[PDB]
């Protein structure tokens, strides 16, 4: 019968892989600014997801061909013994695209690799994409206009965005991104007990409550950040200790 | 001695103890000005009535509008955005129509979704600040084998997803019948797959379940639906995957009001 509280089965041998694509600088021809603070984000995420049982693999400043090769490689190995899959992008972006070192990649191309017909062993399992990407312009706060569309994907995907249309993404050059900081704080405290979209909702509250009435940089005043997640999940998702 | 200090609470819920639940608007579009070259939407009136009963049972004041022109629709939604919602828990707005990109069709023209949600952001609607603003959108691509000229068996019509899964402001929840690359289904007597399943879940669980948890059940119900191969073989590969884009900041329940 229909169960209103059904949860994803998370009792496989492994939690699964968490991929992190970390982009700090870009080929000069793209004329994009460096992303100081992103290495703090990478380390923060690595610790949180490792603690949740994930096998975390980080890749710094891959070219687009290299990045596509790597994510395709992961999409074609067996996830039969895994609970789920996580993929994080830390970069600049525009519209449907995220930047690699030398060129843009379409988000739909990346998510498409993990759809049922392409990745059988993840069918019915959570596929979670976390995207910290917006428009490229001592602890300094950099402020970027939202630019990356809050795109959906297939069944059992969860697409998590640092910022919604009309708002602004913030990154501290020492402490890291507002969104990743608050995400990681919540993961550390509640990741192993709370339902994951409930947790992302806490992240929405934390980030949107950060004040922008008195910035060190006067030009940043009033540039609020509101994250968003787009859920195509079909069950409750927990990361209880394995 | 106990009280809730202002510490971060992982279980915080929207306060839903106002005098009224709030207004639920339903914009119901069954047919369109001939110049738009859009097909009729048989079954949408079942959707409208279904939604009216479920949201009324949850305490909402439901107001339905059928086939408004774009000017009329904008006037009406602007009217609602400019009254005081001080005594309300929340606000619901439903669109049942065709759509394309960031647009929903009214009777005679397209309207941009951001124009509609924009009316309810921050100071434009102060009395809804910090309160859930829930938009439910059943809108996809009208099949246009259908002349540019001036014009009950249960059939399942299948429309490609066309409307962007747009976000909005803080405390908005944007609910979409279908995601990019999938297909929306509507039975000409029984109504839309998404609305049918939304309404069934509202009736069974609406008064207890956290609302995004309920929307997740709707995702499961809809994405598991299949058409019978005999009635329409051409619909075989056309799965429906709904989604919701949450900018909510707290848990949302619709417990019966005291
Ligand atoms: O979500 C956003 C985030 C931003 F930073 C800026 C603008 C938008 C709104 N646009 C979209 N949002 C979701 C899905 C598709 C689109 C979309 N797709 C094509 C063209 C326009 N919008």
Q: Whose CA is nearest to atom 6 of ligand 1?
A: A165
The tokens of A16 are what? 């699964």
Burial A36-73 (b: 16+ CB within 10 A, else e): bbbebbbebbbebbeebbbebebbebbeeeebbeebee
CA pair distance A237, A62, nearest whole angstrom: 31
Give residues after which chain B gaps, C-N over 2.5 angstroms. Answer: 151
A to B CB pairs, distance under 8 Å: 114
The CA-atom distances, in angstroms, between B173 and each of B29, B129, B132, B135, B258 are: 22, 13, 7, 6, 25
CA pair distance A100, A61, nearest whole angstrom: 7
Within A58-158, residue ranges assigned H as helices are 64-76, 107-112
According to DSSP, the β-strands at A168-172 and A141-145 are antiparallel
User: Does B247 contact A at CB distance below 8 Å?
Assistant: yes
Q: Where are the domains of chain B?
A: 1-258
Among residues B94, B106, B100, the alpha carbon closest in space to that of B163 is found at B100
Residues 6 or more apart in contact with residue A14 via CB below 8 angstroms: A53, A55, A81, A82, A83
Q: Whose CA is nearest to atom 2 of ligand 1?
A: A149
The tokens of A56 are what? 């975390």
Query: What are φ and ψ of residue A236, in 5° steps?
Result: -75, 145
CA pair distance A153, A161, nearest whole angstrom: 13
CA pair distance A157, A60, nearest whole angstrom: 24
Strand partners, A19: A57, A87
Between helices A178-190 and A38-51, what is the axis angle to 10°? 20
Look-up of token digits 């289904």 = B185
HEC readout, A43-67? HHHHHHHHHCCCEEEEEECCCHHHH
Strand partners, B93: B25, B135
Among residues A39, A161, A144, the alpha carbon closest in space to that of A92 is found at A144
CA pair distance B46, B53, nearest whole angstrom: 11
CA pair distance A172, B76, nearest whole angstrom: 44
Question: Does the domain spanning A1-242 belong to CATH 3.40.50.1460?
Answer: yes
The DSSP annotation for chain B comes to: -----S---TT-B----SSB--EEEEEE-----GGG-----TTHHHHHHHHHHHHHHTT-EEEEEES--HHHHHHHHHHHHHS--TTBS-EEEEEEEEEEBTEEE-SSSEEEHHHHHHTTSGGGGGGGTTS-EEEEEEEE-----S-SS------EEEEE--B-----STTEEEEES--TTSEEEEETTTEEHHHHHHHHHHHHHTTTS-HHHHHHHHHHHHHT----TTT-GGGTT-----EEEE---SB---PPP-
CA pair distance B171, A94, nearest whole angstrom: 25
- Cα dihedral sign for B142, B144, B145, B146? positive
Q: A126 to chain B, minimum CA–CA distance in Å?
A: 13
Which residues, numbered 192 to 211 in chain B, qualify as contacts with chain A under a Cβ-Cβ cut-off of 8 Å?
204-205, 209-210
Cβ <8 Å between B245 and A229 = yes
Instruction: Enumerate the residues of chain A whose CB falls inside 8 A of the CB of residue B169.
Output: 164, 166, 226
The one-character DSSP state at A134 is: E
Cβ <8 Å between A150 and B169 = no
Q: Order of strands across the sheet with A168-172?
A: A141-145, A168-172, A176-177
Cβ atoms A152, B176 nearer than 8 A: yes
Cβ <8 Å between A234 and B213 = no
Query: What are φ and ψ of residue B93, in 5° steps?
Result: -135, 125
The tokens of A2 are what? 């229909």
According to DSSP, the β-strands at B61-66 and A228-231 are unpaired
CA pair distance B181, B179, nearest whole angstrom: 6
According to DSSP, the β-strands at B172-176 and B243-246 are antiparallel
**Count of CB atoms within 10 A of residue B211's CB?**
24
Among residues A190, A195, A167, the alpha carbon closest in space to that of B212 is found at A195
CA pair distance A113, A109, nearest whole angstrom: 7
| 3-state secondary structure at position A87 | strand
Instruction: Enumerate the residues of chain B whose CB falls inside 8 A of the CB of residue A204.
Output: 170, 246-249
The number of helix segments (H) and strand segments (E) in chain A equals 5, 11
The tokens of B246 are what? 């949450």
Q: B103 to chain A, minimum CA–CA distance in Å?
A: 16
User: Does A236 contact B at CB distance below 8 Å?
Assistant: yes
The DSSP annotation for B69-82 comes to: -HHHHHHHHHHHHH
- Cα dihedral sign for B189, B192, B196, B197? positive
The one-character DSSP state at A35 is: -
CATH architecture of B1-258: 3-Layer(aba) Sandwich (3.40)
Cβ <8 Å between A233 and B251 = no
The CA-atom distances, in angstroms, between B55 and each of B33, B47, B77, B203 are: 30, 12, 18, 9
Query: What are φ and ψ of residue A153, in 5° steps?
Result: -160, -145
What technique was this entry resolved by?
A: X-ray
According to DSSP, the β-strands at B23-28 and B61-66 are parallel
CA pair distance B229, A92, nearest whole angstrom: 45
CA pair distance B40, B32, nearest whole angstrom: 7
Burial B52-88 (b: 16+ CB within 10 A, else e): bebbeebbbebebbebbebeebbeebeebbeeebeeb
Look-up of token digits 């097909």 = B39
Strand partners, B139: B97
Strand runs labelled E in chain A: 17-22, 55-60, 85-94, 97-99, 104-106, 127-134, 141-145, 157-161, 168-172, 176-177, 228-231
């Amino acid at each position: 019968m229909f169960d209103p509280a059904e949860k994803y089965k998370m009792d496989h041998r492994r939690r699964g892989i968490a991929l992190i694509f970390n982009h700090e600088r870009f080929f000069w021809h793209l004329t994009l600014p460096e992303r100081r603070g992103t290495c703090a984000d990478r380390d923060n995420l690595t610790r949180r997801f490792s603690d949740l049982g994930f096998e975390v693999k980080c890749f710094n400043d891959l070219k687009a061909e290299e990045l596509l090769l790597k994510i395709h490689e992961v999409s074609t190995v067996s996830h039969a013994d895994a609970d789920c899959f996580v993929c994080v992008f830390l970069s600049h972006g525009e519209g449907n695209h995220i930047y690699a070192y030398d060129a843009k990649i379409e988000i739909q191309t990346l998510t498409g690799l993990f759809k049922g017909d392409k990745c059988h062993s993840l069918v019915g399992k959570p596929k979670i994409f976390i995207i910290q990407a917006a428009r490229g312009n001592t602890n300094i706060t950099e402020v970027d206009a939202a630019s990356v569309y809050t795109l959906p994907a297939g069944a059992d995907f969860l697409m998590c965005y640092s910022v919604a249309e009309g708002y602004y993404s913030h990154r501290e050059t020492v402490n890291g991104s507002w969104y990743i900081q608050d995400l990681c704080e919540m993961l550390g405290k509640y990741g192993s007990s709370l339902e994951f979209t409930e947790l992302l909702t806490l992240v929405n509250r934390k980030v949107s409550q950060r004040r922008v009435d008195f910035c060190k940089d006067p030009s940043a005043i009033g540039k609020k950040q509101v994250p968003c997640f787009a859920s195509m999940l079909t069950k409750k998702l927990h990361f209880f200790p394995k």
